[PDB]
Amino acid sequence: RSYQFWDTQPVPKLGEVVNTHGPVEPDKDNIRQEPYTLPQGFTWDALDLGDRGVLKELYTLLNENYVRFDYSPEFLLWALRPPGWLPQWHCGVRVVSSRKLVGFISAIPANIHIYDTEKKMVEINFLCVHKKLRSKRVAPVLIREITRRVHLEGIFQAVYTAGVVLPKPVGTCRYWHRSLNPRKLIMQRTMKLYRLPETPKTAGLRPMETKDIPVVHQLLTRYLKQFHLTPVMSQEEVEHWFYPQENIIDTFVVENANGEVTDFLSFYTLPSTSLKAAYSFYNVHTQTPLLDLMSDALVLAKMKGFDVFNALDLMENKTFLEKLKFGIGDGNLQYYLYNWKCPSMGAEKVGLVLQ
Numbered sequence: 001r002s003y004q005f006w007d008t009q010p011v012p013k014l015g016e017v018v019n020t021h022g023p024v025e026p027d028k029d030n031i032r033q034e035p036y037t038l039p040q041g042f043t044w045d046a047l048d049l050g051d052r053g054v055l056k057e058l059y060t061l062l063n064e065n066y067v068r069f070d071y072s073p074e075f076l077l078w079a080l081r082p083p084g085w086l087p088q089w090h091c092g093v094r095v096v097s098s099r100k101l102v103g104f105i106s107a108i109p110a111n112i113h114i115y116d117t118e119k120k121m122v123e124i125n126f127l128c129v130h131k132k133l134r135s136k137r138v139a140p141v142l143i144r145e146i147t148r149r150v151h152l153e154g155i156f157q158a159v160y161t162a163g164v165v166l167p168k169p170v171g172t173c174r175y176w177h178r179s180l181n182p183r184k185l186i187m188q189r190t191m192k193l194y195r196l197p198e199t200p201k202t203a204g205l206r207p208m209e210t211k212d213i214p215v216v217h218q219l220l221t222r223y224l225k226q227f228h229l230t231p232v233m234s235q236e237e238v239e240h241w242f243y244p245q246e247n248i249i250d251t252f253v254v255e256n257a258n259g260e261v262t263d264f265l266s267f268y269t270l271p272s273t274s275l276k277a278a279y280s281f282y283n284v285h286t287q288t289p290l291l292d293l294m295s296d297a298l299v300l301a302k303m304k305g306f307d308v309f310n311a312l313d314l315m316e317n318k319t320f321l322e323k324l325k326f327g328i329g330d331g332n333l334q335y336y337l338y339n340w341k342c343p344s345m346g347a348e349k350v351g352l353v354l355q
C-alpha cells in the first residue's frame with residue numbers, strides 16, 4: 001500500500017511509531033498567492049452560503065455525490081457557518097461555462113486541545129467530487145487549495161475524520177447503533193426487547209434554553225479535560241453548537257431540585273434516504289449517572305420520532321453501549337491531524353465529535 005498524494009503531505013507515515021509532539025513543518029512566512037491550476041474549463045469558487053441559490057447548489061451536490069444521507073440547507077448552515085466561518089473556506093470547483101458545481105471541500109475554525117498543547121486549527125468536512133469526475137485526482141487539488149486558503153489566514157494544523165485508512169490515524173472509533181423503531185429497520189420478540197420507556201427517568205430534565213448557555217459552556221469545558229483530543233469552545237461557539245434547532249440539534253439540560261444545571265445530553269439530526277437518525281453529540285454528567293443520561297436520550301429520540309440512535313465508542317461511551325443494547329455497526333471512523341505529530345490514542349481518549 002503506497003499513498004501517491006498523502007506521502008507528499010506533512011503527516012506521519014502509516015506504521016511509523018510516533019513518540020514526539022509537534023508540527024511536521026513550520027508555519028510559513030510566505031504563501032502561494034495564486035490558486036492551484038485546474039484543468040481547462042473549470043474554475044475555483046468561494047461559495048457564499050448566505051445566498052440561498054448558492055446554498056441550494058451545495059445541497060444538490062452533496063445529496064447526489066456525497067458518502068443515502070439527506071443534508072438539509074438549514075443543517076448545512078449549522079455545520080458550515082459556526083463563529084469565524086469564511087466564504088473562501090467553502091471551497092468549490094465549478095464548470096466555467098455552466099457554473100455547475102462539481103467539487104467541494106470546507107474548513108471551519110476550531111481551537112483544538114491535543115495532549116498538552118492547544119493550537120488554532122480548522123476542521124475539514126464535506127470533501128466531495130462529482131461522480132462523473134471521480135478517480136481523476138480532483139480530491140488532491142481540493143485538499144491543496146483549501147490548505148492554501150487556510151494558510152493565508154495563519155493556520156497550519158487541521159483535524160478531520162474519514163472512513164478510509166490514510167496516513168495516519170491519531171485514533172480509531174467504531175460506530176454503534178440502537179434500534180428505536182424496529183419496524184422500519186425490518187419478530188414480535190425482537191420488537192419487545194427494544195421497547196423503551198415512554199417518559200424519561202431523570203428528574204429536572206428539560207430543553208436547553210438561552211439561560212443555560214453559560215452553565216452548559218462551563219460543564220462542557222470542565223468535562224473535556226479528561227480527554228486527549230478535544231475542542232476548546234468559546235461561549236459563542238457553545239451557543240451555536242448546542243442551542244436547539246428543530247430537526248438539526250437537540251440539547252436537554254438536567255436542572256435539579258435546587259435549580260442547578262448539573263448534566264446535559266445532546267444529539268443532532270441526520271436523516272437517510274425516509275430514515276430519521278439521531279447522532280450522539282456531547283453528553284456531560286456530574287450528578288446524573290451517564291447510563292441514566294443516555295437512557296433518557298434514547299427515550300427522547302423515540303418520542304421525537306427517530307428510528308435509530310447512533311453513537312461512537314469514544315469518550316466514556318463504552319461504559320453504556322452494550323448495557324443499553326446498542327449493536328456494533330460495520331466500518332470505522334478514523335481521526336486525523338494534519339501537520340501535527342503525536343502519539344496515537346484509544347477511542348476512549350478522543351473527546352471530539354465531528355459530523
Ligand SMILES: C#CCCC1(CCCCCCCCC(=O)SCCNC(=O)CCNC(=O)[C@@H](O)C(C)(C)COP(=O)(O)OP(=O)(O)OC[C@H]2O[C@@H](n3cnc4c(N)ncnc43)[C@H](O)[C@@H]2OP(=O)(O)O)N=N1
Nearest residue numbers: 003004005006067125126127129134135136137138139158
Ligand atoms: C492547514 C491545513 C490543511 C487542512 C487540510 C487537511 C487535509 C484534509 C483532508 C481531507 C479530509 C476530508 C474529510 C471528509 O470530508 S471525509 C468525506 C469524504 N468522502 C466522501 O465524501 C464520500 C464521497 N466520496 C467522494 O466524493 C470521493 O470520491 C472523494 C474522496 C471526494 C474524491 O476522491 P476520488 O475518488 O475522485 O479519488 P481522486 O480524486 O482521484 O484522489 C484520490 C486520492 O485521494 C485520496 N482520498 C480518498 N478518499 C479520501 C478521503 N476521504 N480523505 C482524504 N483523502 C482521500 C486517495 O487516498 C488518493 O490519495 P492517495 O492514496 O495518496 O493516492 N487540507 N485540508
Ligand SMILES: [Mg+2]
Nearest residue numbers: 134135136138
Ligand atoms: Mg477525481
